[PDB]
Amino acid sequence: TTVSLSAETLPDVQAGSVVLYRKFEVGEVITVRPRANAFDIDLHIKPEYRNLLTSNSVFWAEGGAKVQLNGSGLTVQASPLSRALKGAISFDNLSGASASQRKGDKRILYASETAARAVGGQITLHAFDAGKLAVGMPIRYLGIDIGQIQTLDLITARNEVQAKAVLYPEYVQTFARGGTRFSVVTPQISAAGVEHLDTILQPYINVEPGRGNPRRDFELQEATITDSRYLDGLSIIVEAPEAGSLGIGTPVLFRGLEVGTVTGMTLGTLSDRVMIAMRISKRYQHLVRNNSVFWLASGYSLDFGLTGGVVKTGTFNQFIRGGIAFATPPGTPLAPKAQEGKHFLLQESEPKEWREWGTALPK
Amino acid sequence: TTVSLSAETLPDVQAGSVVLYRKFEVGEVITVRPRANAFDIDLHIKPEYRNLLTSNSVFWAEGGAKVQLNGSGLTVQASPLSRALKGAISFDNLSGASASQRKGDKRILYASETAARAVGGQITLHAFDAGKLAVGMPIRYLGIDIGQIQTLDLITARNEVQAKAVLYPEYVQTFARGGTRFSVVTPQISAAGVEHLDTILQPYINVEPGRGNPRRDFELQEATITDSRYLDGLSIIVEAPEAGSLGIGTPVLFRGLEVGTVTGMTLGTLSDRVMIAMRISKRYQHLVRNNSVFWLASGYSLDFGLTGGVVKTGTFNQFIRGGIAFATPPGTPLAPKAQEGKHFLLQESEPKEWREWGTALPK
């Protein structure tokens, strides 16, 4: 016996199994020494490698012939029978696993490789409905996998679901800094068209980063659409009497070109006006001014003629998601740029002069 | 022979098979001693572990090479040939299985692990149509698996299907308390858009908890939509001359913001008015008052113009699901909050002044 182990549950571990290292075989498991409360596992490694063995090492266990799918994959490694018959143990060093050996007496055998990387990077979410969440669900940023949900805990004292997820140690300091918005993505089949196609197969969690204190306690927000494409933009609040056909994902239009989208919809402080939160992209941030009137351009408007009736149908997005359109009135002194927070007043009718304005906006 | 067993049916059990413990091998099956009415099974376990063996232990049997799907899984454990050739027996302790040994002479070998957890947590449902139910169908609360249907019994004396399901021993006391609404979920493809996408693959049973006496005899209600998202809300009843385009899932609108949904539709006590049951969310509970007139806002309404016609088309939800909208008339003494049960009278026309009301509702 060269290095011992401890664990609470031993589903896979079988005596006589082979010790792996980077999916390569060195060492041997010899003894499962049982206890009533917490079982003990003993390992043999060679006398040269135990000098190479570091106190910053973690041991993770896996067992059985695993065919992994992982999209379009089936391959099984060059494997001995000792994994095929008995539950194996692999190991590797990492940087900051010294704290797991400072606490307790001996090392712990993690149930898989995922729980072996769950030191320091483990965060906790709070969701009202775990109908979209799943164990093994990846947390993605810009479509790059930076984390994974590993468990789901239901609480009936406070009726909500605590999902504890992990982050990889490169991104544990960059993310989880407070003001971080975790949001699931999901397919939508409704009056609003769908943009997410892969989420029918495998849903993930989009994330917005933030800056501040390392909180590591988060709330899962609703399924948001604006956050993924239109980011780090100029946030504009517009007040309206009605909602109308507006919604999350409704485009903001300038001469028919989509310059931004609506982030969210909320009642006002006093319940007389709804506020519609939108973001304009950085390339189009300079377009809005302090004198930039909005108007609701939602759905089809056509004029009847008595002698003869001229009609036109664009089949545009504002039928499905009724957009807000704007233009700047002409002024030879130009009003300054819009601030990070500014309240606009929506006009109910489209002002007729908007074709003939022609306000020069440079850069 | 150290511990004996009894069972009625013996599909999997083969003499010579290995005894498992937390998917780890200790002990050995030795003898299948047959009888005409109820067969007897005999087990060998080691003299140290039989002292460790507790009267609160259950034995469950499983047999054969099971490649399980479980979503995206196929993994087969590190297994001996003794399971691969012969039907094995595993065991574990639990808290309250002493009652199974109080009754009868000896322990019973359950047919699988699921029936071994079916002590005390076994409830009974009564459904009119088992077209949606299935054996092995999970019962979920907030998307957390808290139970499983294990059998289906047709009765032709009373034409209905008794489905007997189990609950895990943590949630047997928190749930099954009377006033508990079990409802299946199912995909819908109709005039109303679908919100449930996973139910095409695997349907489950949503459940609302209640408080009272431990009934453990329940009625399976119809497929409800309002219950999952809008819960613990202010229940409001509105009376209308006709149904119209109303239905379960119809949104309640305040300045076009969805504040709540319709729970169900029911004929009145006297058949002159239908009552439309709605719930308002807790965050929006304070919006309604004792003077809050409703109106039916369903489908597309447009005005014709003779010289020229102005038209607008939202393609909003209320064409698909015709919503009820409200606003509060101005009063310098404010009427109190709506009670847990209060009957409103629906107005057929949209009252024109509603934009110019501007009633200040605090908090």
Coordinates of N, CA, C and O in Angstrom, one line a residue, chain A residues 80-216:
Chain A
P80 N -7.7 -2.4 -21.3 CA -7.4 -3.7 -20.8 C -8.7 -4.3 -20.3 O -9.8 -3.7 -20.2
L81 N -8.7 -5.6 -20.0 CA -9.8 -6.3 -19.3 C -10.1 -5.8 -17.9 O -11.2 -5.9 -17.4
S82 N -9.0 -5.2 -17.3 CA -9.1 -4.8 -15.9 C -10.0 -3.6 -15.7 O -10.6 -3.4 -14.6
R83 N -10.2 -2.8 -16.7 CA -11.3 -1.8 -16.7 C -12.6 -2.5 -17.1 O -13.7 -2.2 -16.6
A84 N -12.5 -3.4 -18.1 CA -13.7 -4.0 -18.6 C -14.4 -4.9 -17.6 O -15.6 -5.1 -17.7
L85 N -13.6 -5.5 -16.7 CA -14.2 -6.3 -15.6 C -14.4 -5.6 -14.3 O -15.3 -5.8 -13.6
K86 N -13.4 -4.7 -14.0 CA -13.3 -4.1 -12.7 C -13.3 -2.5 -12.8 O -12.9 -2.0 -13.8
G87 N -13.8 -1.9 -11.7 CA -13.9 -0.4 -11.8 C -12.6 0.3 -11.5 O -12.0 0.1 -10.4
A88 N -12.1 1.1 -12.5 CA -10.8 1.6 -12.5 C -10.7 2.9 -11.8 O -11.7 3.5 -11.4
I89 N -9.4 3.4 -11.6 CA -9.1 4.7 -11.0 C -8.0 5.3 -11.8 O -6.9 4.8 -12.0
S90 N -8.3 6.5 -12.3 CA -7.3 7.4 -12.9 C -6.9 8.5 -12.0 O -7.6 8.9 -11.1
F91 N -5.8 9.2 -12.4 CA -5.4 10.4 -11.6 C -4.6 11.3 -12.5 O -4.1 10.9 -13.5
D92 N -4.5 12.5 -12.0 CA -3.7 13.6 -12.6 C -3.4 14.7 -11.6 O -4.2 14.8 -10.6
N93 N -2.4 15.5 -11.8 CA -2.2 16.6 -10.9 C -3.1 17.8 -11.4 O -3.6 17.8 -12.5
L94 N -3.2 18.7 -10.5 CA -3.8 20.0 -10.8 C -3.2 21.1 -9.9 O -2.4 20.7 -9.0
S95 N -3.6 22.3 -10.1 CA -2.8 23.4 -9.4 C -3.2 23.6 -8.0 O -2.3 23.5 -7.1
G96 N -4.5 23.7 -7.7 CA -4.9 24.2 -6.3 C -5.7 23.2 -5.5 O -6.6 23.6 -4.7
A97 N -5.4 21.9 -5.6 CA -6.1 20.8 -4.8 C -5.4 20.6 -3.5 O -5.6 19.5 -2.9
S98 N -4.6 21.5 -3.0 CA -3.9 21.3 -1.7 C -4.9 21.5 -0.6 O -4.7 20.9 0.5
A99 N -6.0 22.3 -0.8 CA -7.0 22.5 0.3 C -7.8 21.3 0.6 O -8.3 21.1 1.7
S100 N -7.9 20.3 -0.3 CA -8.6 19.1 -0.1 C -7.8 18.2 0.8 O -8.3 17.3 1.5
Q101 N -6.5 18.3 0.8 CA -5.6 17.5 1.7 C -5.3 18.2 3.0 O -5.0 17.5 4.0
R102 N -5.4 19.6 3.1 CA -5.4 20.3 4.3 C -6.5 19.9 5.3 O -6.3 19.6 6.5
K103 N -7.7 19.8 4.7 CA -8.8 19.3 5.5 C -8.8 17.7 5.4 O -8.3 17.1 4.5
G104 N -9.3 17.1 6.5 CA -9.3 15.7 6.6 C -8.0 15.1 6.8 O -6.9 15.8 7.0
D105 N -7.9 13.8 6.8 CA -6.7 13.0 7.0 C -6.1 12.6 5.7 O -4.9 12.8 5.5
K106 N -6.9 12.0 4.8 CA -6.4 11.4 3.6 C -7.2 11.9 2.4 O -8.1 12.7 2.6
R107 N -6.7 11.6 1.2 CA -7.4 12.0 0.0 C -8.7 11.3 -0.2 O -9.0 10.3 0.4
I108 N -9.6 11.9 -0.9 CA -10.9 11.4 -1.2 C -11.0 11.0 -2.7 O -10.3 11.6 -3.6
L109 N -11.6 9.9 -3.0 CA -11.8 9.4 -4.3 C -13.1 9.9 -4.8 O -14.2 9.6 -4.4
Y110 N -13.1 10.8 -5.8 CA -14.3 11.4 -6.4 C -15.0 10.4 -7.3 O -14.3 9.5 -7.8
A111 N -16.3 10.5 -7.4 CA -17.1 9.6 -8.1 C -16.9 9.5 -9.6 O -17.1 8.5 -10.3
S112 N -16.3 10.6 -10.2 CA -16.0 10.7 -11.6 C -15.0 11.8 -11.8 O -14.6 12.5 -10.8
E113 N -14.6 12.1 -13.1 CA -13.7 13.1 -13.4 C -14.3 14.5 -13.2 O -13.6 15.5 -12.9
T114 N -15.6 14.6 -13.3 CA -16.3 15.9 -13.2 C -16.3 16.4 -11.8 O -16.1 17.6 -11.5
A115 N -16.6 15.5 -10.8 CA -16.5 15.9 -9.4 C -15.1 16.1 -8.9 O -14.9 16.7 -7.9
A116 N -14.1 15.6 -9.6 CA -12.7 15.8 -9.3 C -12.3 17.3 -9.6 O -11.4 17.8 -9.0
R117 N -12.9 17.9 -10.6 CA -12.6 19.2 -11.0 C -13.5 20.2 -10.2 O -13.5 21.4 -10.4
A118 N -14.4 19.7 -9.3 CA -15.3 20.5 -8.5 C -14.7 20.9 -7.2 O -15.2 20.6 -6.1
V119 N -13.7 21.7 -7.3 CA -13.0 22.2 -6.1 C -12.8 23.7 -6.4 O -12.1 24.1 -7.2
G120 N -13.6 24.5 -5.6 CA -13.6 26.0 -5.8 C -14.5 26.5 -6.9 O -15.0 27.6 -6.7
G121 N -14.6 25.8 -8.0 CA -15.5 26.2 -9.1 C -16.9 25.9 -8.9 O -17.7 26.1 -9.9
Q122 N -17.4 25.4 -7.8 CA -18.7 25.0 -7.6 C -19.6 26.1 -7.1 O -19.4 26.7 -6.1
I123 N -20.6 26.5 -8.0 CA -21.5 27.6 -7.7 C -22.9 27.0 -7.4 O -23.1 25.8 -7.5
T124 N -23.8 27.8 -7.0 CA -25.2 27.4 -6.6 C -26.2 28.3 -7.2 O -26.1 29.5 -7.0
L125 N -27.2 27.7 -8.0 CA -28.2 28.5 -8.6 C -29.5 28.3 -7.8 O -29.6 27.4 -7.0
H126 N -30.5 29.2 -8.1 CA -31.8 29.2 -7.5 C -32.8 29.4 -8.6 O -33.0 30.5 -9.1
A127 N -33.5 28.3 -8.9 CA -34.5 28.4 -10.0 C -35.9 28.1 -9.4 O -36.1 27.3 -8.5
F128 N -36.9 28.8 -10.0 CA -38.3 28.5 -9.5 C -38.8 27.2 -10.1 O -39.7 26.6 -9.5
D129 N -38.4 26.9 -11.4 CA -38.9 25.7 -12.1 C -37.7 25.0 -12.7 O -37.0 25.6 -13.5
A130 N -37.5 23.7 -12.3 CA -36.4 22.9 -12.9 C -36.9 22.1 -14.1 O -36.3 21.0 -14.3
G131 N -37.9 22.6 -14.8 CA -38.4 21.8 -15.9 C -37.5 21.8 -17.1 O -37.5 20.9 -17.9
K132 N -36.7 22.9 -17.2 CA -35.7 23.0 -18.3 C -34.3 22.4 -17.8 O -33.5 22.0 -18.7
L133 N -34.0 22.4 -16.6 CA -32.7 22.0 -16.1 C -32.5 20.5 -16.1 O -33.5 19.8 -16.1
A134 N -31.3 20.1 -16.2 CA -31.0 18.7 -16.2 C -29.6 18.5 -15.6 O -28.7 19.4 -15.6
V135 N -29.3 17.3 -15.2 CA -28.0 16.9 -14.7 C -27.1 16.7 -15.8 O -27.4 15.9 -16.8
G136 N -25.9 17.3 -15.8 CA -25.0 17.3 -17.0 C -25.2 18.3 -18.0 O -24.7 18.2 -19.1
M137 N -26.1 19.3 -17.7 CA -26.4 20.4 -18.7 C -25.3 21.4 -18.7 O -24.9 21.9 -17.6
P138 N -24.7 21.7 -19.9 CA -23.6 22.6 -19.9 C -23.9 24.1 -19.8 O -25.0 24.5 -20.3
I139 N -23.1 24.9 -19.1 CA -23.2 26.3 -19.1 C -22.3 26.9 -20.1 O -21.1 26.6 -20.1
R140 N -22.8 27.6 -21.1 CA -22.0 28.1 -22.2 C -21.9 29.6 -22.2 O -22.9 30.3 -21.8
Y141 N -20.8 30.1 -22.6 CA -20.6 31.5 -22.9 C -20.1 31.7 -24.3 O -19.0 31.1 -24.6
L142 N -20.9 32.4 -25.1 CA -20.6 32.6 -26.6 C -20.5 31.2 -27.3 O -19.8 31.1 -28.2
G143 N -21.3 30.3 -26.8 CA -21.3 28.9 -27.4 C -20.1 28.1 -27.0 O -19.9 27.0 -27.5
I144 N -19.3 28.5 -26.0 CA -18.1 27.8 -25.5 C -18.5 27.2 -24.2 O -18.9 28.0 -23.3
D145 N -18.3 25.9 -24.0 CA -18.6 25.2 -22.7 C -17.7 25.6 -21.6 O -16.5 25.4 -21.7
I146 N -18.2 26.3 -20.6 CA -17.4 26.8 -19.5 C -18.0 26.3 -18.1 O -17.6 26.8 -17.1
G147 N -18.8 25.3 -18.2 CA -19.3 24.8 -16.9 C -20.4 23.7 -17.1 O -20.7 23.3 -18.3
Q148 N -20.9 23.2 -16.0 CA -21.8 22.0 -16.0 C -22.6 21.9 -14.7 O -22.0 22.0 -13.7
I149 N -23.9 21.6 -14.9 CA -24.7 21.3 -13.7 C -24.5 19.9 -13.3 O -24.5 19.0 -14.1
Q150 N -24.3 19.7 -12.0 CA -24.0 18.3 -11.5 C -25.0 17.7 -10.6 O -25.1 16.5 -10.4
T151 N -25.9 18.6 -10.0 CA -26.9 18.0 -9.1 C -28.1 18.9 -9.1 O -28.1 20.1 -9.6
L152 N -29.2 18.4 -8.6 CA -30.5 19.2 -8.5 C -31.1 18.9 -7.2 O -31.4 17.7 -6.9
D153 N -31.3 19.9 -6.4 CA -31.9 19.7 -5.0 C -33.2 20.5 -4.9 O -33.3 21.7 -5.2
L154 N -34.3 19.7 -4.6 CA -35.6 20.3 -4.4 C -35.7 20.7 -2.9 O -35.3 19.9 -2.0
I155 N -36.2 21.9 -2.6 CA -36.5 22.4 -1.3 C -37.9 22.7 -1.2 O -38.5 23.5 -2.0
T156 N -38.6 22.2 -0.2 CA -40.0 22.5 0.1 C -40.2 23.4 1.2 O -41.3 23.9 1.4
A157 N -39.1 23.8 2.0 CA -39.2 24.9 2.9 C -39.4 26.2 2.2 O -40.4 26.9 2.5
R158 N -38.5 26.5 1.3 CA -38.7 27.5 0.3 C -38.9 26.8 -1.0 O -37.9 26.2 -1.5
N159 N -40.1 26.9 -1.6 CA -40.4 26.1 -2.8 C -39.7 26.6 -4.0 O -40.1 27.5 -4.8
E160 N -38.5 26.0 -4.2 CA -37.6 26.3 -5.3 C -36.6 25.2 -5.4 O -36.5 24.4 -4.5
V161 N -35.8 25.2 -6.5 CA -34.9 24.2 -6.8 C -33.5 24.8 -6.8 O -33.2 25.6 -7.6
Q162 N -32.6 24.3 -5.9 CA -31.2 24.7 -5.9 C -30.4 23.8 -6.8 O -30.3 22.6 -6.5
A163 N -29.9 24.3 -7.9 CA -29.1 23.6 -8.8 C -27.6 24.0 -8.6 O -27.3 25.2 -8.7
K164 N -26.8 23.1 -8.2 CA -25.4 23.4 -7.9 C -24.6 23.0 -9.1 O -24.5 21.8 -9.5
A165 N -23.9 23.9 -9.7 CA -23.2 23.7 -10.9 C -21.7 24.0 -10.7 O -21.3 24.6 -9.7
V166 N -20.9 23.6 -11.6 CA -19.4 23.8 -11.5 C -19.0 24.7 -12.6 O -19.6 24.9 -13.6
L167 N -17.8 25.3 -12.4 CA -17.1 26.1 -13.4 C -15.7 25.6 -13.5 O -15.1 25.2 -12.5
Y168 N -15.1 25.6 -14.7 CA -13.8 25.2 -14.9 C -12.8 26.2 -14.3 O -13.2 27.4 -14.3
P169 N -11.6 25.8 -13.8 CA -10.8 26.7 -13.0 C -10.2 27.9 -13.8 O -9.7 28.8 -13.2
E170 N -10.3 27.9 -15.1 CA -9.8 29.1 -15.9 C -10.9 30.2 -15.8 O -10.5 31.4 -15.8
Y171 N -12.2 29.8 -15.7 CA -13.2 30.8 -15.7 C -13.9 31.0 -14.4 O -14.9 31.7 -14.4
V172 N -13.4 30.5 -13.3 CA -14.0 30.7 -12.0 C -13.8 32.1 -11.5 O -14.6 32.6 -10.8
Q173 N -12.7 32.7 -11.9 CA -12.4 34.1 -11.5 C -13.0 35.1 -12.4 O -13.4 36.2 -12.0
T174 N -13.0 34.8 -13.7 CA -13.6 35.7 -14.7 C -15.1 35.8 -14.5 O -15.6 36.9 -14.5
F175 N -15.7 34.7 -14.4 CA -17.2 34.7 -14.1 C -17.4 34.6 -12.6 O -16.4 34.6 -11.8
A176 N -18.6 34.5 -12.2 CA -19.1 34.4 -10.8 C -18.6 35.6 -10.0 O -18.2 35.5 -8.9
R177 N -18.7 36.8 -10.7 CA -18.2 38.1 -10.0 C -19.4 39.0 -9.6 O -19.1 40.1 -9.3
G178 N -20.6 38.4 -9.6 CA -21.7 39.3 -9.1 C -22.3 40.1 -10.2 O -21.5 40.7 -11.0
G179 N -23.6 40.3 -10.2 CA -24.2 40.9 -11.4 C -24.2 40.0 -12.6 O -24.3 40.5 -13.7
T180 N -24.0 38.7 -12.4 CA -23.9 37.7 -13.5 C -25.2 37.1 -13.7 O -25.9 36.6 -12.8
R181 N -25.7 37.1 -14.9 CA -27.1 36.7 -15.3 C -27.0 35.3 -15.9 O -26.5 35.2 -17.1
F182 N -27.4 34.3 -15.2 CA -27.6 33.0 -15.8 C -29.0 32.8 -16.3 O -30.0 33.2 -15.7
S183 N -29.1 32.3 -17.6 CA -30.4 32.2 -18.2 C -30.4 30.9 -19.1 O -29.4 30.7 -19.9
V184 N -31.4 30.1 -18.9 CA -31.5 28.9 -19.8 C -32.0 29.4 -21.2 O -32.6 30.4 -21.4
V185 N -31.7 28.5 -22.1 CA -32.2 28.7 -23.5 C -33.1 27.5 -23.8 O -32.8 26.4 -23.3
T186 N -34.1 27.7 -24.6 CA -35.1 26.7 -24.8 C -35.8 27.0 -26.2 O -35.8 28.2 -26.6
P187 N -36.3 26.0 -26.9 CA -37.0 26.2 -28.1 C -38.3 26.9 -27.8 O -39.0 26.5 -26.8
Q188 N -38.8 27.8 -28.7 CA -40.0 28.5 -28.6 C -40.8 28.2 -29.8 O -40.3 28.3 -30.9
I189 N -42.1 27.8 -29.7 CA -43.0 27.6 -30.8 C -44.3 28.3 -30.4 O -45.1 27.8 -29.6
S190 N -44.5 29.5 -30.9 CA -45.5 30.5 -30.4 C -45.7 31.5 -31.5 O -45.4 31.2 -32.7
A191 N -46.3 32.6 -31.2 CA -46.5 33.7 -32.2 C -45.1 34.3 -32.6 O -45.0 34.8 -33.7
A192 N -44.1 34.1 -31.8 CA -42.7 34.6 -32.1 C -41.9 33.4 -32.7 O -41.9 32.3 -32.1
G193 N -41.2 33.7 -33.8 CA -40.5 32.6 -34.5 C -39.2 32.2 -33.6 O -38.8 33.0 -32.8
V194 N -38.7 31.0 -34.0 CA -37.7 30.4 -33.2 C -36.3 30.8 -33.8 O -36.2 30.9 -35.1
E195 N -35.3 31.0 -33.0 CA -33.9 31.2 -33.5 C -33.0 30.1 -33.0 O -32.0 29.8 -33.7
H196 N -33.4 29.4 -32.0 CA -32.5 28.3 -31.4 C -33.0 27.0 -31.9 O -34.1 26.5 -31.6
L197 N -32.1 26.3 -32.7 CA -32.4 25.0 -33.3 C -31.8 23.9 -32.6 O -32.4 22.8 -32.5
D198 N -30.5 24.0 -32.1 CA -29.9 22.9 -31.4 C -30.5 22.6 -30.0 O -30.3 21.5 -29.5
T199 N -31.2 23.6 -29.4 CA -31.8 23.4 -28.1 C -33.0 22.5 -28.1 O -33.4 22.1 -27.0
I200 N -33.5 22.0 -29.2 CA -34.4 20.9 -29.2 C -33.7 19.6 -28.7 O -34.2 18.8 -27.9
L201 N -32.5 19.4 -29.2 CA -31.7 18.2 -28.8 C -31.1 18.4 -27.4 O -31.4 17.7 -26.5
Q202 N -30.2 19.4 -27.2 CA -29.5 19.6 -26.0 C -29.5 21.1 -25.6 O -28.9 21.9 -26.2
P203 N -30.3 21.4 -24.5 CA -30.3 22.8 -24.1 C -29.1 23.1 -23.2 O -28.5 22.3 -22.6
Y204 N -28.8 24.4 -23.2 CA -27.7 24.9 -22.4 C -28.1 26.1 -21.6 O -29.3 26.5 -21.6
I205 N -27.1 26.8 -20.9 CA -27.4 28.0 -20.2 C -26.5 29.1 -20.7 O -25.3 29.0 -20.6
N206 N -27.1 30.1 -21.3 CA -26.3 31.3 -21.7 C -26.0 32.1 -20.4 O -26.8 32.0 -19.4
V207 N -24.9 32.9 -20.5 CA -24.5 33.6 -19.3 C -24.0 35.0 -19.7 O -23.3 35.1 -20.7
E208 N -24.4 36.0 -19.0 CA -23.7 37.3 -19.1 C -22.7 37.5 -18.0 O -23.1 37.4 -16.8
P209 N -21.5 37.9 -18.3 CA -20.5 38.2 -17.2 C -20.8 39.5 -16.5 O -21.6 40.4 -17.0
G210 N -20.2 39.7 -15.4 CA -20.3 40.9 -14.6 C -19.0 41.3 -13.9 O -18.0 40.6 -14.1
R211 N -19.0 42.3 -13.1 CA -17.9 42.8 -12.4 C -18.3 43.1 -11.0 O -19.3 43.8 -10.8
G212 N -17.5 42.7 -10.0 CA -17.7 43.0 -8.6 C -17.1 41.9 -7.7 O -15.9 41.5 -8.0
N213 N -17.8 41.5 -6.7 CA -17.3 40.6 -5.7 C -17.6 39.2 -6.0 O -18.7 38.9 -6.6
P214 N -16.8 38.2 -5.7 CA -17.0 36.8 -6.0 C -18.1 36.2 -5.2 O -17.9 35.6 -4.2
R215 N -19.3 36.4 -5.7 CA -20.5 36.0 -5.0 C -20.7 34.5 -4.8 O -20.9 34.0 -3.7
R216 N -20.8 33.8 -5.9 CA -20.9 32.3 -6.0 C -22.3 31.9 -5.4 O -22.3 30.9 -4.7

